[PDB]
Amino acid sequence: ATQGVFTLPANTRFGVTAFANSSGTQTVNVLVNNETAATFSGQSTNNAVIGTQVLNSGSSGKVQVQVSVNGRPSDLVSAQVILTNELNFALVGSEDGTDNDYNDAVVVINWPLG
Numbered sequence: 001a002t003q004g005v006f007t008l009p010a011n012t013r014f015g016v017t018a019f020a021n022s023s024g025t026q027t028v029n030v031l032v033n034n035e036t037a038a039t040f041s042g043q044s045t046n047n048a049v050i051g052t053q054v055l056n057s058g059s060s061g062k063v064q065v066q067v068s069v070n071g072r073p074s075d076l077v078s079a080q081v082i083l084t085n086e087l088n089f090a091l092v093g094s095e096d097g098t099d100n101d102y103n104d105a106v107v108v109i110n111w112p113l114g
């Protein structure tokens with residue numbers, strides 16, 4: 001199934017933050033309505049934050065996370081969780097290799113802000 005694609009409410013600010021846990025430099029691209037809105041890159045095996053940013057979901061609300069390592073797309077896992085009918089999380093893990101820890105880039109999107 002498709003992973004890493006989330007429909008947000010339109011015209012709403014949201015946060016996106018990426019963490020790395022791999023020997024490989026992770027590149028995380030965040031598309032809003034199919035156009036690049038942020039791109040983060042970095043290397044850590046210690047959960048370093050490789051980027052954090054506030055972005056607007058725009059007219060479509062469509063947000064897609066892509067993760068690439070060594071020029072190759074990583075395998076993605078994702079889900080969304082909503083607490084008290086108000087606080088939203090879109091969660092992505094990714095695997096760049098064969099150990100299947102799925103933490104090589106971890107991406108957390110949260111809304112609403114403010």
Ligand SMILES: *C(=O)C[C@@H]1O[C@@H](C)[C@@H](O)[C@@H](O)[C@@H]1O
Nearest residue numbers: 021022023096097099101104
């Ligand atoms: C080896 O390069 C694989 C790669 O880096 C490891 C240190 C570990 O984080 C593994 O999950 C990652 O796929």
Ligand SMILES: [Ca+2]
Nearest residue numbers: 100101102104
């Ligand atoms: Ca891995």
Ligand SMILES: [Ca+2]
Nearest residue numbers: 021022101104
């Ligand atoms: Ca890892």
